Amino acid sequence: PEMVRGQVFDVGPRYTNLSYIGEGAYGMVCSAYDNLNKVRVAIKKISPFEHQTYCQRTLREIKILLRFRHENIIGINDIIRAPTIEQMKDVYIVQDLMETDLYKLLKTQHLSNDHICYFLYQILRGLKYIHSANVLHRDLKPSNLLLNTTCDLKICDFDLARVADPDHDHTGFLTEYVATRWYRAPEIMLNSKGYTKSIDIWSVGCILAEMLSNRPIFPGKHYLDQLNHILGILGSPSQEDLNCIINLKARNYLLSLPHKNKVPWNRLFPNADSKALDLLDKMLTFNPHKRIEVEQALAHPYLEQYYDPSDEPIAEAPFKFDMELDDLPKEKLKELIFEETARFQPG
Ligand SMILES: O=C(Nc1ccc2n[nH]c(-c3ccncc3)c2c1)[C@@H]1CCN(CC(=O)N2CCN(c3ccc(-c4ncccn4)cc3)CC2)C1
């Protein structure tokens, strides 16, 4: 078994000639040569079985991507693991190899408007399909948007994805959250568990702003500083939005703040297209109930050159009910991971 940066990649006969891409808490991602399709692929080695939370995230990643088939969503081409549950210690997930991600691209290049427009179109096209399956991505950010030189974009990383549950979205003020700080909607800090589609639209708004200036729009240094950044640009919420805030503590907090005027989008982004900023405004709407939905965003004048509902497919088989992985022990989750990966075994 070949080694990369001091890690055993036991991918067997089908995959050889490895090369390091990146790393994270999840494990390591590498490029490899596929000996059955004759093309280079991405392979990531995951070792989650010692903790329930790592098993939940691994089962979410696998279960969702196996049920999706869309041009703007990374697939899972193969999964390698041991023939028995007793011997399964690692899981290797094989995916299409891309050239870079939007995080890396924005460090080296300023994007023209027509690149921004096409990338935004693909993000929303993929998100329409996700949301049509009643699924929430919950961690959209530049490093989860994969790109190639032909400018194809694919959304990856569904380890925080959940089935939408608007009836159980409520939570208290300043409730802990797992998804990436800078892309969190204001309601996450005020009254929301991130169980509605609107959570993803806010993240897309953040990504659009980031493509317009090569800098994150709301770079909070810590948890409440994230809401300081959001309110710093959006200004004080309206009386109507305060009347929608649910929590006594959230309402008291917002009423205690000095009045702050809205920073105009054309001052933050003086060289941006006016239609891009009108769409940005609608995605970065404070009240999640008034925030634009994915189908409305695709229909916005900024994306009119690409908008074609007949070429923006939806899911055939939406997730009807919640996955219910929150109260399952790590041993049960290992069994489910084993069962979900069975279709890739020889025999
Ligand atoms: O899918 C992912 N990345 C991909 C995919 C295909 C690509 N093709 N081309 C590229 C590419 C990117 C950049 N530049 C050039 C090319 C790809 C990148 C990322 C990598 C990780 N993945 C999520 C994931 O697989 N999981 C969620 C987290 N989970 C998890 C979390 C933590 C731990 C953990 N274990 C031990 C200690 C601490 N934490 C274990 C499991 C494992 C499953 C999202």
Curated annotation (Swiss-Prot):
CDD domains: STKc_ERK1_2_like
Residues where Phosphotyrosine is found: 177
Motif TXY positions after renumbering to this chain: 175-177
Gene Ontology MF: a single term: ATP binding
Keyword Zinc: no
Domain Protein kinase: residue ranges: 15-303
Modified residues (Phosphothreonine): 175, 180
Keyword Kinase annotated: yes
Cofactor dependence: Mg(2+)
Entry's Gene Ontology BP terms: androgen receptor signaling pathway; animal organ morphogenesis; apoptotic process; B cell receptor signaling pathway; Bergmann glial cell differentiation; cardiac neural crest cell development involved in heart development; caveolin-mediated endocytosis; cell surface receptor signaling pathway
Reaction(s) the record says it catalyses: L-seryl-[protein] + ATP = O-phospho-L-seryl-[protein] + ADP + H(+); L-threonyl-[protein] + ATP = O-phospho-L-threonyl-[protein] + ADP + H(+)
Mutagenesis / variant outcome for changing residue 115 to A: Reduced affinity for DCC. Strongly reduced affinity for DCC
Entry binding sites for ATP: 21-29, 44
Entry PTM: Dually phosphorylated on Thr-175 and Tyr-177, which activates the enzyme. Phosphorylated upon FLT3 and KIT signaling. Ligand-activated ALK induces tyrosine phosphorylation. Dephosphorylated by PTPRJ at Tyr-177. Autophosphorylated on threonine and tyrosine residues in vitro, which correlates with a slow and low level of activation. Phosphorylation on Ser-19 by SGK1 results in its activation by enhancing its interaction with MAP2K1/MEK1 and MAP2K2/MEK2. Dephosphorylated by DUSP1 and DUSP2 at Thr-175 and Tyr-177. ISGylated.
Phosphoserine, modified sites: 19, 236, 238, 274
Regulation of this protein's activity per its record: Phosphorylated by MAP2K1/MEK1 and MAP2K2/MEK2 on Thr-175 and Tyr-177 in response to external stimuli like insulin or NGF. Both phosphorylations are required for activity. This phosphorylation causes dramatic conformational changes, which enable full activation and interaction of MAPK1/ERK2 with its substrates. Phosphorylation on Ser-19 by SGK1 results in its activation by enhancing its interaction with MAP2K1/MEK1 and MAP2K2/MEK2. Dephosphorylated and inactivated by DUSP1, DUSP3, DUSP6 and DUSP9. Inactivated by pyrimidylpyrrole inhibitors.
Subunit structure: Binds both upstream activators and downstream substrates in multimolecular complexes. Interacts with ADAM15, ARHGEF2, DAPK1 (via death domain), HSF4, IER3, IPO7, MKNK2, MORG1, NISCH, PEA15, SGK1, and isoform 1 of NEK2. Interacts (via phosphorylated form) with TPR (via C-terminal region and phosphorylated form); the interaction requires dimerization of MAPK1/ERK2 and increases following EGF stimulation. Interacts with MAP2K1. Interacts with DUSP6. Interacts with ARRB2.
Annotated function: Serine/threonine kinase which acts as an essential component of the MAP kinase signal transduction pathway. MAPK1/ERK2 and MAPK3/ERK1 are the 2 MAPKs which play an important role in the MAPK/ERK cascade. They participate also in a signaling cascade initiated by activated KIT and KITLG/SCF. Depending on the cellular context, the MAPK/ERK cascade mediates diverse biological functions such as cell growth, adhesion, survival and differentiation through the regulation of transcription, translation, cytoskeletal rearrangements. Acts as a transcriptional repressor. Binds to a [GC]AAA[GC] consensus sequence. Repress the expression of interferon gamma-induced genes. Seems to bind to the promoter of CCL5, DMP1, IFIH1, IFITM1, IRF7, IRF9, LAMP3, OAS1, OAS2, OAS3 and STAT1. Transcriptional activity is independent of kinase activity.
Notes concerning its domains: The TXY motif contains the threonine and tyrosine residues whose phosphorylation activates the MAP kinases.
UniProt record similarity statement: Belongs to the protein kinase superfamily. CMGC Ser/Thr protein kinase family. MAP kinase subfamily.
Protein name: Mitogen-activated protein kinase 1
Organism: Rattus norvegicus (Rat)
Gene it is expressed from: Mapk1
